[model samples]
Target chain A: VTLTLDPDTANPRLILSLDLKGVRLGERAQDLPNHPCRFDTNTRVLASCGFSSGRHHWEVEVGSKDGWAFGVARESVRRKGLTPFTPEEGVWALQLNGGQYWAVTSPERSPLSCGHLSRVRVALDLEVGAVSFYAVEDMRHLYTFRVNFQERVFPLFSVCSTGTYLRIWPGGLEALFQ
Target chain B: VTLTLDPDTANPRLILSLDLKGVRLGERAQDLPNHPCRFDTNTRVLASCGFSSGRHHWEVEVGSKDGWAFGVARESVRRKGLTPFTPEEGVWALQLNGGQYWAVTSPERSPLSCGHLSRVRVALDLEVGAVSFYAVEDMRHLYTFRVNFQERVFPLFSVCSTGTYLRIWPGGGATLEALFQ
Candidate 1:
């Protein structure tokens, strides 16, 4: 299924497309009210749709950008502070920065030993409490986070710094026989 | 580089999108003038752009549709009547039909022992005289044909029967490193 970025939770420094499929870092913070759900300090945004149960999957065209993070975050995760981006903090995410891949885990971030990726597939199995990431180009497994989730989670996106961008592919994941 | 389907080379039994990226089999033959380049009896079409030298690559999203063929062919290949679809006839292609894969070669079609494929990559190196086909999903090599060329070769697509369709992935082939390493 198609997923769109939620403007309500977007940081002012993050600029999203009119269709809400693309997001990137902006020069300065835009003038907007400080909503409870808005990310006031981080350059991040969440998908408008969230899931509490059932299996869900989506893909993001990360292209060759070097600074970006995507995955899922608990809907109740903090948005106004320097929130610790970890599973304990309700954020299960993977990062691509400084020409390296990372799994943003609790305590400390785990580095992924893979080359550059053009696209990423985020498969969320709510009942199984698994958030798996794969290199969409060849279906290579990158990393997966296992957590006993207790709240609704939305697809999270962190567009770091200027010029870095991410696009939610128009159509979701392709149906291929395993 | 982007490639578009050439309507002049399309068969009357085939229908292509306005953008020329999608093609499918039509219910009945269309009443259009039979140009010399048109495939009058075969349900096929060729890309408007062709290559005579250097390396060229493209990918076709064949999806789950059962009957389809794609690869490259000489621009002078016959387009009318009973045409022999083989490398000797200046046509190098791969076909997926009846739940089986094939390399349309001379004398006989070589059967491919593989599972279902969602997409296929065709890499043509004219100087190397090589035409390679790969399953795009996993970057697995299916088959390759070694043939010397003397003419410009165009990307060929054959949409067979009703309900079968093929789409030229707009951005062409993806930049991928060898996965085996």
Candidate 2:
């Protein structure tokens, strides 16, 4: 599914975190074993710990609050036991190349539906910044989507099969938390 | 004097020479001598010789043509009676700094010009060539005027109150006989 920011608002800065509630480490092939979800304030999302299998998977807890979520699954086949998250494994990060803006994520993984998705709180840190979503087919191609937040406002999160979609909310902590 | 050649003319090539005329070989002072006329050329020029000089003097010649010349004069000083033009002087020669485009002949008594204004024929092998005149107030510079070509065409020659200023035409040959005399 596609995700976009509030265009009427000014540019928004957002920080996103994903809490894998029920999935245990090393148990589910789709779940990240023992690693905490990584967050890049610059991009606004969390990524899975490097996994070995070819199948990509990850889940996030979204609350009643609305926003955007974008994620990627990394693979470390050769260096399975090397480091926790060495870039050598190959990271499936999301990004936007150009255009008015549209959210796109990796299509390698099929989307899964979550029950009581409302319990999942997708909090956003809106300060003096902005976030965007993009999909890279390979190393060469990229697609992007932008969000602008002029003032503090609530954004509704949409569900999609692919996790590469991006959402941007601009403002400070107070604006986002409130 | 201006020199020109026409590919379509009866004598497509123009031949000229400058004879020393009434000028004597050993009469001028070693320190001061008449200014030699400057030889200018429109094209390349060549200078060769089979001549002689009596006194000791320095001869220096520069060229507008793309080559060099070598010789000596009578006004130049000598050591132990030996001079640049003398057979004993060997091949004493001076050349322009930039490439094979230009060069000058040494003033040691060789079959060339000697001392500032020695007996020398600065000929132009150029199909088209001309010389301009200039003036100098101090002994350091010069002031000159246009002169006539006593022969078919004027040869480029210059005299030195201090030194000589001269040039040669490209391609040396018998055709330069008239211009050099």
Candidate 3:
């Protein structure tokens, strides 16, 4: 269940490690080959794997990163400029900015206080039509969204600061067992 | 292969995530039961898994941490007090401090320059009796150690600053296929 940030869909300004398990925002954008799936406007990347059914969960190390986003995005979600990140736009995401947490929902965004959680967890349960976020340190719930998932969705991530890295846990939550 | 930090061996001031793949220095030390294998002075930890055979390679994201250490040590390496970290002392490591890198070698430490590489690659080829370090960004060789590894060795890491994380790459280098292709 180990997931990776897809380089093809990565923004030019985002630097993906050779292993693809780590990513960070860079001062300069590399001249990457143009691909329709690339994110030109947002410094974001989607996982190489997608899910259409069942319950799946993963964790990311946000560490001391000031601004970032983590959640799930529909495969059909727009990859071009200034895309509105909302469930109505097929992006179910939670963003952290200005020392505050915001759930990217339609009509309005909900502010959440998870208390400087270094690691964030995302749980997607297709059967229950719910996407939940948590602070992995204590399994404290951060936010949840009810969605009528209509298609396959990929885990999404965004990094707005330079030098800091967004690293996905080695495997899914179930990978804990040897 | 995926490896994790042995919490029992972690220093009191080191905070390891529940998954054990991530670790950082904490503001306050936790009061825990004393154990023989735990690191008592140096803020360091060793992997639960050890290697005595085969060529094993893994990467760690040092990020912007001003000071840190990454390498391997004998399973019997000292766990308490100000232990001397050197190859002769059964530890081989590369450290970064004050914008400079140093290799922990006998007699004296050897200084190395590989630039500001964010991710470090540790290649342990037991067959060759060699441990090499690299900047994962471009496969640039950083330093190498010639050792007569006589016992099982665990991957070692040390964190000197707070708020920065040292993460181990998942499933080693072989996990890149499905994602990169």
Candidate 4:
């Protein structure tokens, strides 16, 4: 499904395209109106839609971006800075930095196969409590996490490098929610 | 019609996606494979498809990019450095940069109405010797260039910002070109 970066939740330094299907690290930080949902320090954004019960699938284009992250975020996750975004912190993610990919969680995040991944496809089966990650291009299964999900989960993203960016593919997250 | 980006003609730092429908500015310049048609200095890429006749229409997702340019170029145009990509230089384009939009040509490119442009649609009627541009989302009518269609012309792109990107809309250019053939 196609997903969008929520402008309201995005950092001032992050630029989201008009269609909400793209996001980028802007050259200069913006002086936009403030909101409690906004990321004060992190270059990040969350999906406009969230799921609590149904199984969902989506793909994110990692493409040539150097430093970025994506996965799921509980709606109640902290919106401020330097807060460790781990599974224990209500954010479960996969991060690519310094040419490496790691499953982000609370205490133990095992290193996964790392390369220039083309795209990352996610399969989240809430009923069975498992979230799986796959490299659609590499055709490699990365990792999976199981949890007793307590609340709604939303798509999440982060861009750290000036050239880093990612687009949610199947670009149809809107279709699923609408 | 469908068009393929000629990797040989692209700047080393300009990375075209494997599918060739989308392009972005890469963080590092690459030591490429080969080429007589490469853009050695400019951040530019040319499409493999060019037309000598008939009408064609294609939409490019100029959506949410910061700085970029796109349009058609004469097949034989130079691929080197800053030579002013005006029509006199055998290139015709629409540019979006620094909060401005312009129809680029040989002489007098007028300042265009600019806003939150989501996609750019180009309607090229070679038989009528005209190329028109539109902001598909804004539903705004942009300028049209009337030129003599003397040579085969290919799609052209320029990406300047690190976050800037654009893609062939709906990814069906190849299908369109094949059906036209």
Tens digit per residue, CA lDDT, model 2, A44-152: 2222122222222222332221122333322211212222121122222221111111223333322222222222112222342233221221222122222233333
Off by over 4 Å in 2: A1-48, A56-58, A63-66, A73-178, B1-181
DockQ of 2: 0.01
lDDT tens digits, residue span A59-163, model 4: 888736345778887888787765665788676778765345678764755667655677888887778877888888666788888877788888888775444
Chain B in candidate 3 has what TM-score? Answer: 0.88
By TM-score rank, best first, the candidates go: 1, 3, 4, 2
Total backbone clashes of candidate 1, pairs 3 or more residues apart or in separate chains: 0
The iRMS of the candidates, in order, is: 17.0, 43.9, 13.9, 18.2
| Interface CA root-mean-square deviation for model 2 | 43.9
Task: Return whichever of 3 and 4 wins on TM-score.
Answer: 3
Computed on C-alpha atoms, the DockQ of candidate 4 is: 0.01
- iRMSD, model 4, in Å: 18.2
Q: How would the docking of model 4 be graded?
A: incorrect
lDDT against the true structure, each candidate: 0.79, 0.23, 0.77, 0.74
TM-score comparison, 2 vs 3, better candidate: 3
Per-model TM-score on C-alpha atoms: 0.48, 0.15, 0.47, 0.47
Candidate 4's displacement at residue A162, Å, is: 0.9
Chain A TM-scores for all candidates read 0.90, 0.22, 0.88, 0.87
- Comparing 2 and 3 by lDDT, which wins? 3
Question: Per-candidate DockQ versus the true complex?
Answer: 0.02, 0.01, 0.02, 0.01
